[PDB]
Design an enzyme around this catalytic site. Structure first.
Site, PDB file in Angstrom:
ATOM      1  CG  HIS D  60     -46.091  -1.791   0.583  1.00 34.49           C
ATOM      2  ND1 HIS D  60     -45.757  -1.804   1.919  1.00 34.49           N
ATOM      3  CD2 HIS D  60     -45.616  -0.626   0.087  1.00 34.49           C
ATOM      4  CE1 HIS D  60     -45.114  -0.691   2.220  1.00 34.49           C
ATOM      5  NE2 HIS D  60     -45.014   0.042   1.125  1.00 34.49           N
ATOM      6  CD  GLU D  63     -48.568  -2.331   5.870  1.00 36.29           C
ATOM      7  OE1 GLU D  63     -48.203  -1.632   4.903  1.00 36.29           O
ATOM      8  OE2 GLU D  63     -47.936  -2.375   6.945  1.00 36.29           O
TER       9      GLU D  63
END
Ligand code: CDL
Ligand code: CDL
Ligand code: CDL
Ligand code: PC1
Ligand code: PC1
Ligand code: PC1
Ligand code: PEE
Ligand code: HEM
Ligand code: HEM
Ligand code: UQ1
Ligand code: UQ1
Lengths: 68, 54, 354, 454, 79, 84, 176, 95
Positions: D60, D63
């Site tokens: 995460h 990203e």
């Protein structure tokens, strides 16, 4: 203020009465079967036996005397 | 005198005079003759064309 | 329960246009309580081992025992009178068309009452009672071995009395419970009026309807007190004061007056089971008399010609039952049964359109 | 019962999806469409599930930092270049799949391929960018800053998959977020973002040959493969309860109940899609043309009648699929006093599939399922998601005609067989947040998966 | 195949009052857009549970009145 | 467009046949309850039947030799004529 | 399975009778036997039994309505669900006069009185409810066909309802 | 209870528990009414019974006369049966 405005009720507004339909079918069934028994035993059956007993005047094969 | 028909209903049964029943209506109801004053309400208006004017 | 009582007695609204035929039900409830109380009190002095000698000991030795004995016998007659009149009313105003649930609850109590009364007669332990049960029990003689299970012996004895007595003690309390189920539906499903429609003319019950209902019950009490103490009407057959003798058959084996309609049905039809079955028809067909109709109407407040001929059919059958089995009465009575079937078909059948 | 085939000629009139495998192992899939806009992106077979407990949250974080500058660009230059092309760069991260897709015009297709390749292959994970994102991720991590639908989505996985990595969340625990550094992200890129796990999807005014040529040129230096993933047994489904009773957050209670579902490739997956459609969704604040009291949906109609008020302020079914497991259930947002009726009705609805499901409800559900699936394929991004998600899940894209063909075979009897095998008398997991005095014990709710009638 | 839309279709107009396809911004990410792809602040997947109806929930608002009661009147034992 | 309306009116023409089917489907789903009812009846009504039928009903598994050592009729334990 | 076969028989027998004309919309010529019956029995039966009996009842009914001062349609009981659904949509003018007539009728009936003859010269068989009865039946038939074509399953004895279909709470004995 | 339109209540005050049945018999009065009355303590309480006496019994006997023809047919049958029984007994026995 003023009279209530007219509006239809969201339905369905019927249902939930299956016990009453059961009683109808049970009562009709019982009383329809009582009609058959009473019609047979009190009217038909008696007359049928008389015919058979007068159909024994022919006595081609009436019931045997012994045949116990 | 009274406009009702005493003999509107027939058959075996106890006598009754009433205007209405609960029976279901057909998919294609009979077209009412509104020109002569027959009533057009419910199924005979929606599922018929008696309301159309030229 | 005080709030419940206030909701169902003090703030209960009923139409102000009802007749005195809407008071019959109040009387049933009151006379029913009296029959339970007197029964329990009589039980304090009764020995079910010999109820012939027990009834004598109540009327001769117990202080005011005669009151208990005659109230319990006469108040039964009264219970059946008021009940049968309550049905006649409900038929006349066709109070079964929209309040069938009330009608169903009532019929359950009628079935229970028919069992309570019969078994109470046998507790008298007299000739008529003994031979009467010996005749009825032999209608279910076809079901194998069931007579023996009900009787407890090969012939009616105290063994049978000791078991039926428990049914007679307990079944009335259950009836009182069904009376609550009956008053429950009446209060939810509002009562019917003398007029076919529903009108905003309701008045509270305690201040008006109960005063009128008491005027009615006190009127009936005046008449019931005269019968209770002077036997103005013969409502109990005398042959129940004859000691039981299994060898000699009574002059006439008949039930109490409130079982003569069904006794006649059973003595008129030529096959025993057909008779039993036509008794079932009488107490079952009347529960479906509005089911096949299709018009938006309750068939109410017409001349009720079919109703009148039905009420007379009941009375006429009770007469034939009193009469001995003379052949002439049997033929005439069979026509009255055929006529009843036809009148009942008239109620049932829906109508076609011209 | 079989009522015929609903496949039409128009279903066959769709441009084919051409999928080719590059020598390095990267699949390139394209579909031509008569549009002036396109969607080109990279759908990767990476996610939180494929992270370890100590590194959960790295994917995460990566990203969130992959578009903050490359080794050949800067954040300002990169953002300026995309804006000049009239394009926008998007990205998401899930448990099992990830994507980095750009929505651009026709002239920006190949230029965007270059931009995405640079971000994925040469990310400049600057420390300053990481530290700023650490604050943003930490704030998001706070449950006060998370919606209740997001909270219950995560807690359903936590409760159902206690033994495996599917229970891990995408954002990760706060302890890991506090410690993630560039080295963590560099390792994740090296191990997971490999050619064998990537699919380049191009949807729009595109030519397969040209896209393939550009893809091979720009992704030449990608790592060809990484070691095969460790073989594991079926994710164990734990019938548990994770309820956060809180009587200080308002009157609305949020409850999610889950059954064990099926994997993507299961023969029963389409049946579970239809069952999800039959459950449907309902919101008192968006009832539609048909009111709840007169709805064809049986759950909605019975619920709308409860207490003359309605026992479902909101509810929706959910059917979540993974490579080797799935979750099937419903989510409810309802008044505190209505929770017992709400969960009872939806469980009665799911139990009804195994006894008394009408052909009428199935056929309506088929049409609304097909109306939802087809409408999702309207825009290029919708098509691109469908291609990328379907190739990762199945290795191929199911045509609309094939989906309808397989759905035609499914009937009320097939739904009943599947439900009887998997959902009847089955173990359930309940999760909730809010005033939940009315929520009963798990065992009490689990007995509602079977009927005494029938 | 995946389902990309909520089981409850919106049924409302996408473009806002007075806004056109030319002046609505970019509907994919604009804040006022009714079809903006949601934000993956905590990851992807929560949209399967999300309530996309814009109006906040009014707990206990009645939807099961068949016309038997006026607003503000409390039914007693369903009557 | 009247054609569309004709079909939309006619789609519910056969309501009575659809409602009959629904109730039959309910009745079908109650049929399996017989497997427990009929044996439970015979279990309760076993003692009503005669010895000859008790044996047939059980496929010979029950017979007079299977009556308890202390039969409810003491004079008939071990057979109708007693043990010896 | 024998149920699956029965389902095909039912499906095929109903597909073969779709669009059939109802028995009452078929031009029907009575059987010769019925024609003979309708020329011997019907005439005499009407002149001697039906005619007189049904005029005797009808005239009495008109008199009873005139005594109460009510119309025939006033006599309908609202416990009937078609009547209730019609009374929802009657206009206020009709509604007001309907209530006043019914109120006067109940007062007179309760007090054992009759309407003064001065007010009795009216036709009690005017069908003023007919339009609204027909509308109500149409509304009910739509609900029956579109919303009640199957014996639905619902959780039993919950929310104050038995789950067997009724929609009002505390409307049965077992639901108290 | 009454129709759902009749029992629909204008007021928002809760129905008292002891008045449940009372308010299930509510009617929506159309157009209004002016109800009047006097306490029985200031009225003649027996006169109306006398005033209505003739009309009550006239309208009762005119309705009950509907059953006359039915009653006569039934009594004719009762007499025919009685005589048939007697002649049959005198024929079977009675030399
Ligand atoms: C060889 C074998 C031959 C066999 C031949 C055939 C034999 C058949 C026997 C049939 C026996 C049962 C008949 C009734 C079944 C009803 C089933 C049902 O679902 O009803 C619900 C139904 C409610 O309808 P619903 O509103 O549609 O249901 C929706 C609600 O949810 C409903 O909920 P609700 O709350 O509104 O209503 C429920 C209500 C329903 O319960 C009842 O009201 C009665 C329930 C029990 C059945 C009836 C029992 C009758 C008992 C009579 C007294 C016996 C005394 C015995 C004394 C013995 C002493 C030793 O519950 C209660 O009252 C509380 C309990 O109840 C009724 O309407 C029927 C009540 C019973 C009326 C009488 C029926 C008679 C039928 C047979 C013909 C007459 C024979 C007389 C013989 C007399 C001998 C002395
Ligand atoms: C051996 C010698 C033999 C000698 C000869 C013997 C002869 C006599 C014996 C033979 C007698 C044969 C009798 C045949 C009866 C046939 C009845 C028939 O055609 O039924 C059609 C009839 C449909 O009537 P409908 O008017 O078209 O629909 C009813 C509604 O108005 C409209 O309803 P809807 O369809 O719009 O609403 C749906 C709802 C409609 O549901 C109902 O209407 C059910 C009502 C239940 C009433 C009982 C309430 C609970 C018990 C009360 C206490 C009773 C004691 O249905 C359901 O919920 C479907 C599932 C129901 C079962 C749920 C699971 C089991 C629960 C058990 C409790 O359905 C029923 O009667 C269903 C059964 C209800 C009564 C059950 C009684 C059980 C026995 C008690 C003793
Ligand atoms: C005969 C041997 C044979 O072919 O057996 C296979 C035949 C069909 O087996 P299947 O295809 O697996 O279907 C299972 C259902 O029993 C198939 O039965 P269903 O789903 O049609 O259930 C109704 C069943 C049971 O119906 C009733 O019990 C009627 C109850 C009325 C109340 O009635 C029948 O079995 C057929 C009745 C119609 C005439 C044909 C009779 C053969 O076996 C049976 O149906 C009889 C044995 C069932 C299990 C008893 C434990
Ligand atoms: C003379 C011969 C007479 C023979 C009489 C035979 C009587 C047999 C009685 C069996 C039990 C009947 C119970 C009521 C009917 C079931 C109602 C129902 O399903 O309700 C649904 C409702 C609703 O359930 P549901 O199906 O909607 O499921 C909802 C989800 N759960 C399961 C979590 C509730 O269920 C109940 O509440 C019923 C519970 C079962 C009750 C069973 C009681 C058994 C009592 C002992 C039986 C003894 C037999 C003796 C035999 C004697 C023979 C002579
Ligand atoms: C496939 C193979 C099935 C084999 C079944 C064999 C059953 C033998 C039963 C028997 O003889 O029992 C003896 C008993 C008692 O007979 P018994 O007293 O003579 O004893 C038999 C002789 N000993 C003592 C030597 C064993 O009789 C019965 O139970 C007869 C039951 C007959 C049932 C007939 C039902 C007909 C239904 C028709 C419906 C349609 C019209
Ligand atoms: C198809 C199969 C056809 C062949 C069936 C043969 C039946 C022989 C019955 C017989 O002789 O019984 C006499 C028995 C015993 O006869 P008994 O009454 O004289 O007593 C025996 C005791 N001694 C010898 C000491 C006097 O009688 C009965 O059982 C009478 C009732 C008939 C039983 C039901 C019919 C037969 C059922 C056969 C089932 C076949 C399945 C496999 C076996 C399952 C059970 C273990
Ligand atoms: C809730 C609903 C509950 C329903 C409960 C129903 C209970 C039914 C009980 C049935 C009992 C039957 C008798 C069982 C028993 O022990 O029988 C004892 C005894 C044994 O007698 P034998 O000397 O073997 O000769 C008689 C013919 N064989 O027989 C009897 O008592 C038979 C009674 C039959 C009653 C039939 C009723 C129908
Ligand atoms: C529905 C209510 C009841 C009715 C219709 C009923 C009916 C009767 C009948 C007709 C008699 C016969 C009277 C006589 O011998 O001529 C009788 C006897 C008797 N009853 Fe009841 N009874 C009722 C309830 C009760 C109750 C609740 C009890 C108390 C347990 C009871 C106790 C007795 C006793 C002891 C006898 C025998 C004494 C007697 O002959 O008077 N009864 N009953
Ligand atoms: C133990 C016997 C019973 C008692 C205690 C009893 C009691 C009552 C009571 C108190 C009332 C309300 C007051 C009334 O209007 O008179 C009533 C109403 C009613 N009863 Fe009964 N009853 C009994 C027998 C029966 C029977 C056997 C039937 C059915 C044949 C029946 C059917 C009805 C009906 C239909 C009503 C409603 C009448 C109307 O619509 O107002 N009752 N009963
Ligand atoms: C069917 O039930 C019965 C009645 O109610 C309708 C009766 O009226 C009567 C007749 C009652 C009297 C007082 C003549 C009896 C006996 C009867 O059996
Ligand atoms: C003594 O004779 C009796 C009758 O004779 C056949 C009855 O019909 C009846 C009535 C029976 C039923 C089933 C209504 C009873 C109770 C009775 O005692």
């Amino acid at each position: 203020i003023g009279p209530p405005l007219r509006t239809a009720q969201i339905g369905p507004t019927v249902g939930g009465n299956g016990g009453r339909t059961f009683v109808l079918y049970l009562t009709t069934t019982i009383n329809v079967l009582i009609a058959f028994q009473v019609s047979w035993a009190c009217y038909l059956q008696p007359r049928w036996r008389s015919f058979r007993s007068d159909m024994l005047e022919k006595f081609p094969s009436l019931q045997p005397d012994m045949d116990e | 005198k009274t406009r009702g028909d005493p003999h509107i209903m027939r058959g075996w049964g106890e006598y009754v005079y009433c205007h209405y029943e609960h029976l279901r209506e057909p998919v294609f109801p009979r077209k009412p003759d509104v020109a002569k004053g027959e009533l057009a309400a419910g199924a005979n208006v929606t599922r018929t064309d008696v309301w159309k004017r030229e | 329960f005080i709030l419940i009582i206030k909701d169902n007695i003090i703030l209960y609204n009923i139409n102000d246009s009802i007749n005195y035929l809407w008071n019959i039900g109040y009387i049933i409830m009151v006379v029913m309580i009296v029959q339970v109380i007197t029964g329990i009190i009589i039980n304090l002095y009764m020995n079910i081992n010999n109820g012939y000698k027990g009834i004598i000991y109540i009327i001769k030795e117990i202080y005011y025992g005669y009151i208990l004995r005659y109230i319990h016998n006469n108040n039964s007659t009264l219970i059946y009178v008021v009940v049968y009149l309550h049905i006649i009313r409900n038929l006349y105003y066709k109070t079964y068309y929209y309040n069938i649930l009330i009608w169903y609850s009532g019929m359950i109590m009628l079935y229970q009452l028919i069992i309570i009364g019969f078994i109470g007669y046998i507790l008298g332990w007299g000739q008529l009672s003994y031979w009467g049960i010996t005749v009825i029990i032999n209608l279910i003689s076809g079901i194998p071995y069931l007579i023996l299970l009900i009787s407890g012996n090969y012939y009616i004895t105290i063994v049978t009395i000791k078991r039926l007595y428990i049914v007679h003690f307990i079944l009335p309390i259950i009836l009182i419970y069904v009376e609550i189920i009956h008053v429950y539906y009446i209060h939810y499903l509002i009562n019917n009026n003398i007029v076919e429609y529903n009108v905003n003319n309701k008045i509270i019950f305690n201040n008006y309807i109960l005063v009128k209902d008491n005027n009615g019950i006190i009127f009936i009490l005046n008449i019931f007190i005269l019968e209770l103490n002077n036997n103005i009407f013969i409502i109990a057959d005398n042959d129940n004061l004859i000691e039981i003798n299994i060898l000699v058959t009574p002059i006439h084996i008949i039930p109490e007056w409130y079982y003569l309609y069904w006794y006649s049905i059973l003595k008129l039809l030529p096959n025993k089971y057909s008779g039993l079955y036509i008794v079932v028809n009488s107490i079952s067909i009347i529960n479906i008399l509005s089911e096949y109709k299709i018009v938006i109407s309750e068939y109410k407040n017409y001349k009720n010609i079919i109703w009148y001929n039905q009420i007379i059919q009941y009375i006429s059958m009770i007469y034939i039952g009193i009469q001995l089995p003379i052949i002439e009465y049997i033929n005439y009575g069979r026509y009255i049964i055929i006529f009843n079937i036809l009148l009942l078909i008239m109620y049932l059948y829906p109508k076609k359109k011209k | 019962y079989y009522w015929g085939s609903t496949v039409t000629t128009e279903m066959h009139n769709v441009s084919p999806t051409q999928v080719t495998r590059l020598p390095n192992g990267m699949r390139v899939a394209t579909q031509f469409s008569y549009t002036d806009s396109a969607t080109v992106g990279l759908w990767i077979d990476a996610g939180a599930r494929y992270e370890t407990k100590e590194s959960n949250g790295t994917a995460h974080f990566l990203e969130r930092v992959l578009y903050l500058g490359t080794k050949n660009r800067s954040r300002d230059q990169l953002e300026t270049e995309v804006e000049n092309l009239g394009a926008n760069l998007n990205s998401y991260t899930g448990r099992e799949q990830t994507a980095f897709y750009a929505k651009t015009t026709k002239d920006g297709i190949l230029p965007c391929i270059d931009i995405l390749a640079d971000c994925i292959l040469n990310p400049k994970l600057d420390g300053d960018e990481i530290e700023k994102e650490r604050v943003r991720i930490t704030q998001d991590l706070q449950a006060v800053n998370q919606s209740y639908e997001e909270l219950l989505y995560d807690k359903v996985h936590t409760a159902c998959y206690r033994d495996c990595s599917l229970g891990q969340t995408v954002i990760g625990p706060e302890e890991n977020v506090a410690t993630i550094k560039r080295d963590h992200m560099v390792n994740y890129l090296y191990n997971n973002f490999t050619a064998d796990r990537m699919v380049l999807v191009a949807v729009g005014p595109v030519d397969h040959a040209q896209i393939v040529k550009e893809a091979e040129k720009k992704f030449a230096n990608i790592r060809p493969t990484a070691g095969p993933r460790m073989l594991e047994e079926k994710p164990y489904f734990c019938a548990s309860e994770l309820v956060y009773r809180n009587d200080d957050m308002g009157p609305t209670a949020h409850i999610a109940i889950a059954y064990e579902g099926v994997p993507w490739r299961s023969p029963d997956y389409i049946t579970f899609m239809l069952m999800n459609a039959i459950i449907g969704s309902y919101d008192k604040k968006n009832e539609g043309l048909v009111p709840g009291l007169q709805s064809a949906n049986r759950i909605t109609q019975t619920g709308a009648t409860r207490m003359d008020v309605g026992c479902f302020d909101y509810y929706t079914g959910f059917n979540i699929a993974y490579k080797d497991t799935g979750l099937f259930g419903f989510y409810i947002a309802t008044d505190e006093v209505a929770v017992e009726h709400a969960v009872g009705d939806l469980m009665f609805g799911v139990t009804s599939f195994s006894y008394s499901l009408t052909e009428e409800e199935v056929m309506k559900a088929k049409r609304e399922l097909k109306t939802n699936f087809f409408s999702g394929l309207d825009n290029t991004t919708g098509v691109a998601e469908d291609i990328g998600r379907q190739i990762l899940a199945y290795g191929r894209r199911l045509s609309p005609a094939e989906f309808v063909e397989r759905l035609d075979q499914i009937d009320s009897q097939e739904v009943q067989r599947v439900a009887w095998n998997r959902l009847h008398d089955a173990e359930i997991t309940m999760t909730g947040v809010g005033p939940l005095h009315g929520l009963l014990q798990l065992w009490d709710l689990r007995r509602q998966t079977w009927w005494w009638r029938y | 195949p995946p389902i990309q839309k909520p089981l409850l279709p919106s049924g409302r107009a996408v473009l806002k009052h007075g806004r056109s396809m030319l002046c609505s911004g970019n509907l994919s990410y604009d804040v006022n857009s009714t079809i903006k792809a949601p934000e993956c602040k905590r990851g992807m997947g929560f949209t399967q549970f999300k309530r996309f109806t814009p109006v906040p929930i009014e707990s206990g608002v009645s939807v099961g009145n068949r016309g038997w009661f006026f607003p503000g009147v409390i039914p007693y034992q369903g009557h | 467009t009247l054609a569309v309306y004709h079909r939309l009116w006619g789609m519910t023409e056969q309501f009575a046949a659809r409602k009959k089917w629904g109730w039959r489907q309910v009745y079908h789903r109650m049929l399996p309850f017989q497997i427990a009812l009929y044996p439970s009846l015979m279990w309760y009504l076993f003692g009503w039947f005669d010895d000859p039928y008790k044996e047939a009903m059980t496929l010979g598994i029950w017979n007079v030799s299977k009556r308890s050592l202390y039969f409810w009729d003491p004079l008939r334990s071990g057979g109708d004529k007693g043990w010896y | 399975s024998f149920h699956r076969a029965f389902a095909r028989v039912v499906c095929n027998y109903n597909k073969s009778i779709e669009g059939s004309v109802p028995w009452y919309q078929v031009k029907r010529e009575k059987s010769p036997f019925q024609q003979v019956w309708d020329e011997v029995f019907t005439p005499i039966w009407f002149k001697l039994v039906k005619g007189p009996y049904e005029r005797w009842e009808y005239n009495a009914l008109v008199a009873r309505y005139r005594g109460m001062g009510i119309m025939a349609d006033d006599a309908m009981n609202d416990k009937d669900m078609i009547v209730e659904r019609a009374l929802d949509i009657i206009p206020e003018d009709i509604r007001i006069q309907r209530y006043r007539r019914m109120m006067r009728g109940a007062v007179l009936a309760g007090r054992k009185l009759h309407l003064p003859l001065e007010l009795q010269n009216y036709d009690p068989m005017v069908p003023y409810m007919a339009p609204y009865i027909e509308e109500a039946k149409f509304q009910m038939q739509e609900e029956q066909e579109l919303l009640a074509y199957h014996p639905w399953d619902r959780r039993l004895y919950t929310a104050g309802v038995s789950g067997f279909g009724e929609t009002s709470m505390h409307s049965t004995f077992l639901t108290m | 209870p009454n129709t759902k339109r009749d029992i629909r209540r204008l007021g928002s005050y809760p129905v008292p528990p002891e008045s449940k049945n009372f308010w299930r018999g509510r009617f929506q009065v159309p157009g209004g009414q002016i109800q009047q009355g006097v306490s029985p303590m200031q009225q003649k309480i027996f006169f109306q019974w006398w005033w209505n006496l003739p009309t009550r019994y006239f309208w009762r006997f005119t309705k009950w006369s509907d059953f006359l023809i039915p009653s006569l047919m039934w009594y004719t049958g009762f007499l025919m049966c009685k005589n048939d029984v007697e002649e049959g007994t005198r024929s079977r026995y009675w030399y």
